[PDB]
Design a protein around this nucleic acid. Structure first.
Lengths: 188, 188, 185, 188
DNA sequence: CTTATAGACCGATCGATCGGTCTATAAG
DNA sequence: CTTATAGACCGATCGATCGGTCTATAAG
């Protein structure tokens, strides 16, 4: 119970202040539990974070496969999946924290691999929208794992590095991007 | 000159470990000075950082001034800018610290302003490269703003979210993107 | 039942690490029990430790009682007592923890004698051996008390402080001491 | 200075309560300094301890260096060394903390080596007395290596495990001991 | 009731850590 | 005065540790 309360409050703060910047005490205060409790359930702050990450990944893989139904075309998917990046409440929100985290804990194998994993998931969602988009005669794409990578990483810059502007502004800026991108693909 | 030495080692550590991970103690150990001297020549770690961003962003602009000469067309600029912003050892190599720093001290719009100004200098390079082509038939985009931002964050996403790869590798990915992005532009 | 298994891991840990060094959660984990069950069968880490002490001292006394049967003379006894405090697995292996534990609690009258007589039982054995060795002409210790303490302590040092060499190596050391000591009476 | 105060106080405390039992908070309190300062002067609590140990062995090495002149025969030095061993305020008085510390850190090699080297110095001192005594014909020992370790650990027990007798009554036991030991070292 | 067994939860506090300040220098 | 260099020291915390307690279960 208090565990979940902690997982919840931790996410909120991490998204809002980042990893390092977010303090154990605050988590516990808001969570209304105890440091002793937080550390009872997660060997450490790092673990508290990776945990939240998994919980987040799944909470999304789930939202995508369930939300992409309404999309008919393999193109509509690209348009949507990118739009979600901004409207979602899972994984993307705490992207900054993820950088901040990977940045320093990049020399500890336990953490690294554990994160590239989530990374690739999103890299893949693209590999699919693109591949099956190929054969379904929507575009012929030479290298797909590259275009899928570009697309994944570029959409990421747009999401994390555009925070200052508005939701309905971001949602719109993203759409425009999707468009322009859904072209360099068309012919050769 | 220790101020130079110091600025120097501090750039390494910020690039290598990020903001919160770089400590004043390390900085004085590698620069071989003292807390006194470090704090004499600099007010706060914060202002140490900000000085560097600015001193860096400038050396970048100097680079670009010299590099864009060896280019004839705007489309040619794009590819070059984007590739440069991957090979340059100025400002981009600090994208990490810049993000964690922003995310934490974004609170008081004291650091908020300062950062935007720096990041807006980049959105501007694009606005030039873009409006310059809209007057050279290079292409046509009724909204150079939105596209200067898209291009800006996107390319940044490409640069920061890929530390994995080999530079030669990155360069190719970048160029692929340049082409793709450019493509989907002037065609009503 | 579990109380017994728990006493087991607890004893092992207290010997391997110190008293402070040994955590309850560790005890819980290695015995696969739980906090609840641990703090039900035992009142406190402190008491858990002491109970282990009394039991162990007990089984040692027992071991000595049997084991010495094979020692005709007091001289043979001495050598055996010493070699035994080296090979035994009761009580002596807990020396460290006893020390650490008292150094942080001899400040109370509770733990004071509560473990002070647990050891005088060792200066005792030496007293018997030396004494009964006097009324046997094996030697003429005109001060069993001193010599009895001296031996008990010298042996505790040799046992406690040389924990690095191998067991048979320690025994060689221990027997050499045994001979020198008797040899000097 | 405030560094020295810390060293002084941390010894008494360790001697009195043992390693794990002496808190950094208590040391700073009495030293009238701060945790910040203490952990600026010594990387860690353990390190503080070894530091103390170093000062201790050598302060001891001095006391002996000086006292071993009041003796004309190695037989003499043996009695002295053992007496000095339990009157000195150096090293020996914190055997408890050492024992404790040694077992708890038995696995960390850094510590192990350091700790052993320290102990060996005491064993060597005996080895010297014995070897000299040999060449001087005061006795004949075929295995001074062993008798040294024995003499050292034996004398150690008498010293650490008799904390309740009156010092002058203790130099009495020890002396009886030295007589026995030395005596049992010759043919009969 | 009693006996056991889990296990979530915490008060108290421990050993670090990290910006940064203050006093001492020295020399133009 | 100024610039510049050193370094002992600490305030404010921070993440984790560790005995130990309280509720929940179950079976006799």
């Amino acid at each position: 119970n208090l565990k979940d309360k902690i997982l919840g409050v931790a996410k909120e703060l991490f998204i809002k202040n980042g990893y390092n910047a977010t303090t154990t005490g605050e988590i516990v205060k808001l969570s209304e539990s105890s440091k002793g409790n937080l550390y009872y359930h997660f060997k450490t702050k790092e673990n508290l974070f990776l945990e939240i990450l998994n919980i987040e990944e799944s909470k999304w893989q789930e939202q995508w496969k369930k939300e992409q139904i309404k999309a008919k075309t393999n193109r509509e998917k690209f348009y949507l999946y990118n739009e979600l990046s901004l409207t979602t409440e899972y994984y993307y929100p705490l992207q900054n924290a993820i950088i901040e985290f990977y940045t320093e804990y990049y020399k500890t194998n336990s953490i690294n691999e554990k994160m590239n994993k989530l990374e690739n998931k999103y890299i893949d969602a693209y590999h699919v929208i693109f591949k099956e988009g190929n054969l379904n005669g929507e575009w012929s794409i030479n290298d797909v794992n590259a275009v899928s990578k570009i697309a994944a990483n570029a959409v990421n810059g747009i999401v994390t590095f555009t925070h200052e502007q508005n939701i309905n502004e971001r949602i719109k800026l993203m759409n425009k991007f999707s468009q322009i991108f859904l072209n360099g693909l068309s012919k050769h």
